[PDB]
Amino acid sequence: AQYPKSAIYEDTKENYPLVNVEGSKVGEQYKALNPINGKDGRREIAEGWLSKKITGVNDLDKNKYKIELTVEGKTTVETKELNQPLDVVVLLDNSNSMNNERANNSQRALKAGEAVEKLIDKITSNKDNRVALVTYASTIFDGTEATVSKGVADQNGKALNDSVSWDYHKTTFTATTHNYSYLNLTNDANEVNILKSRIPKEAEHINGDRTLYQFGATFTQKALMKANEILETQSSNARKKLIFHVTDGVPTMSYAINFNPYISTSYQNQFNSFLNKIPDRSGILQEDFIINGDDYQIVKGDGESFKLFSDRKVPVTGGTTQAAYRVPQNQLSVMSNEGYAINSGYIYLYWRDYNWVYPFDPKTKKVSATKQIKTHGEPTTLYFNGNIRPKGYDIFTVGIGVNGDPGATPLEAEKFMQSISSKTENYTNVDDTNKIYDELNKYFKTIVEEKHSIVDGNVTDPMGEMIEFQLKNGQSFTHDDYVLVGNDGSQLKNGVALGGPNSDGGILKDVTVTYDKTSQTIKINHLNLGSGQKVVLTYDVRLKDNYISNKFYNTNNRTTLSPKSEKEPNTIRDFPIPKIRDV
């Protein structure tokens, strides 16, 4: 009437506690003992989990118990080139166009966001890999205060907001952005969950938060820059470096090329000079962009177009003539005094200079007589070639119904997106937002291989010395004498797997359960178990007649798993073993 508190694994020598089996009660004394906990009873091993426990007392007086045995496996990704850890930065477009309503409720932001979450999970299925996330639009959505410039101007470039929803003075906006970024590379399980909680699932509505709606354009350059900065300062050559970029549009903002109006050469020469600093002459160094300022003061574009404007006059919507702003009567006096160029109640509207074709002379406003930057793709591609291509990062780009709106042709747009990927084949434009994840997964598969932890594995379960395996007829082992089921709802029926999603036997296809009458050993053969694939074996046992009183007997001899019985026959994991006794 005394109990052993615990026993010992034969593969690692570490202890496992033995609890009491409740249903085995003979008034305040216990007849059987289970290992680990009184619940699921799992033992974690490098290939997954395994348990072996009495789940049922069949007949207490006669010592008849029901053993349950379970095996659950794992998956990882190992990187094809030389088990090298990855450092991965996801770039996610969260522009207004990504709103779930848009493109006939195509659910861009939701679907993209979920693709990213899935990819982040797969990536981090390898404890070693690291992830970081940058969500962007007019700026990086990282939970800090940001400013953007908006509006139009009169003929002397005095700025006004011409929208009837805003005061005319509202020509910059300032807001705290949503925190949709995680800007340190991390592999910490908790930090990764935080990172996942920051992946946007929606974008702004024009009549939702109208302020943040002003920050919903596409500044692809700032994002690319941020991915580069994270890798450059946080990664190493120890690690392989990947960038996945999910986007729904061509850039509509960009950093300016730092043309210099005060030196005496053609802007085309200044340009050729920027390029000549680079081995391949394909790009412009960071030092030659205007970066060191506040975005609203220095950037080009405001979300309006991929194009910068030759004609500085705002045209009428679907028309040719110059748009004009009817001044409200109660504001005529004030705008006049302020200095606006008012022509009999109306202000004629020009694009603000940040949207003009450039360079142009700061004094005379005259456009360059030579080189002209006419799009936001050009400078973005130049920055990319100049500062990112060199580093050799693998760069995949999944576009979502990219077509060039606003201001690019579909062809112009495909070229741009190719130009900001590692190879031409590293950009794919999907026509349907359910393919977003397939596409991200193809590319990732390029770099990694999925490996299930249990490949042709074997369980060996010999009965303990005082134990009788129960046979329904006392003589022959039959398929009626054990039950094997998989957590995908498949089962061995008469030694043939049936069930699971494809009516093919699932998880249990070609698995077999065999028995050796002599050694009294039950075996599971041919297990192939990935992540969250689990198999459960139940059978019946009886304690043999020749037993010694109040002495706990083991239910099995050494019970083991061989996770890969071909790939590493020597890898052998122990199962915990219950114990029983009677008088």
Please give the C-alpha separations between residue 448 and each of 337, 411, 546, in angstroms, as whole numbers: 66, 31, 57
Ligand-binding annotation for 154, yes or no, is no
Please provide the DSSP assignment of 30-79 as one string.
BSEEEES-SSS--EEETTEEEEEEEEEEEETTTTEEEEEEEEEE-EEEEE
* Smallest separation, CB 433 to Mg ion (Å): 14
CA distance 136 to 146: 12
The answer to whether 305 is annotated as binding is no
- DSSP H/E element including 428: strand 427-430
Q: Is the peptide bond before 315 cis (omega within 30 degrees of 0)?
A: no
In angstroms, what is the minimal distance from the CB of 212 to Mg ion?
14
Q: Collapsing DSSP states into helix, strand and coil, what is residue 155?
A: coil
Structure token digits, residue 573: 């994991």
Q: Which phi-psi region, left, alpha or beta, contains residue 505 (left: φ > 0; alpha: ψ -120 to 50)?
A: left
The entry of Mg ion, Li ion, none that residue 249 binds, CB within 5 to 8 Å by partner kind: Mg ion
Toward Li ion, which CB reaches closer, 516 or 566?
A: 516
* 162 is annotated as contributing to ligand binding: no
Query: Is 7 strand, coil or helix?
Result: strand
Integer-rounded Cα Rg, in Å, for the chain is: 34
Task: Report the alpha-carbon distance of residue 159 to residue 251 in Å, rounded.
Answer: 24
- Cβ 471 to Li ion shortest distance, Å: 4
* E strand residue ranges, 74-186: 75-79, 86-93, 130-136, 145-149, 152-153, 159-160, 172-176, 182-186
Q: Tell whether residue 301 is a contact of Mg ion (CB under 5 A).
A: no
Residue 570 touches which member of Mg ion, Li ion, none, C-beta under 5-8 Å by kind: none
Residues in the interface with Mg ion (CB under 5 A) total 4
The token duo for 525 is 């053969």
What's the closest the beta carbon of residue 476 comes to Li ion, in angstroms?
Answer: 5
At closest approach, how far in Å is the CB of 205 from Mg ion?
14
Determine, following the binding rule CB under 5 A, whether residue 473 of this chain makes contact with Li ion: yes
- Please, are residues 355 and 308 in contact by the beta-carbon 8 Å criterion? yes
CB of 517 to Li ion, least distance (A): 11
For Mg ion, which is the closer residue by CB, 248 or 574? 248
Q: Is 326 in the site for Li ion (CB under 5 A)?
A: no
The beta-strand segments (E) located in 289-373 are 300-301, 324-326, 342-343, 346-348
Q: Which does 97 bind (CB under 5 to 8 A by kind): Li ion, Mg ion, none?
A: Mg ion
Rank residues 434 and 519 by Cβ distance to Li ion and give the closer one: 519
- 3-state per-residue secondary structure call for 196-225: HHCCCCCCCCCCCCHHHHCCCCCCHHHHHH
Q: Which of 5, 366, 423, 472 binds Li ion (CB under 5 A)?
A: 472
Binders of Li ion in range 268-307 (CB under 5 A) = none
Choices 240-248, 354-362, 455-463, 465-473; region in contact with Li ion by CB under 5 A:
465-473
Residues 82-121: x where in contact with Mg ion by CB under 5 A, - otherwise, as a string: -------------x-x------------------------
Beta bridge partners, 78, equal 449
Which residue number, 471 or 498, has a Cβ lying nearer to Li ion?
471
CA distance 542 to 67: 10
- The rounded distance, in Å, linking the Cα atoms of 223 and 229 is 10
Taking the C-alpha atoms of residue 143 and residue 181, their distance in angstroms, rounded to an integer, is 8
Q: Is residue 288 a contact residue for Mg ion (CB under 5 A)?
A: no
Report, in Å, the least distance between residue 515 CB and Li ion: 10
Q: Is 311 marked as binding a ligand?
A: no
Chosen from Li ion, Mg ion, none, partner binding at 423 (C-beta under 5 to 8 Å by type) = none
3-class DSSP state of 293: coil
**Residue number, 326 or 472, with CB nearest to Li ion:** 472
Tell me: is residue 165 an annotated ligand-binding position: no
Contacting Mg ion within 522-541 (CB under 5 A): none
Q: Which stretch binds Li ion (CB under 5 A): 314-322, 331-339, 476-484, 499-507?
A: 476-484
Structure tokens at 64: 């008849």
Distance, CA of 258 to CA of 280 (rounded, Å): 20
Q: Which is nearer to Li ion, 110 or 483 (CB)?
A: 483
Mask 225-254, x = binds Mg ion (CB under 5 A)? -----------------------xx-----
Q: How many separate helices (H) and strands (E) can be counted in the chain?
A: 11, 35
**Does 471 interact with Li ion (rule: CB under 5 A)?**
yes
Candidate list 331, 446, 478, 502; residue touching Li ion; CB under 5 A = 478
Specify binding-site residues for Mg(2+).
93, 95, 97, 218, 248
**Rule CB under 5 A: which residues touch Mg ion?**
95, 97, 248-249
Q: Which residues bind Li ion (CB under 5 A)?
A: 471-473, 478
Annotated binding residues, as ranges?
93, 95, 97, 218, 248
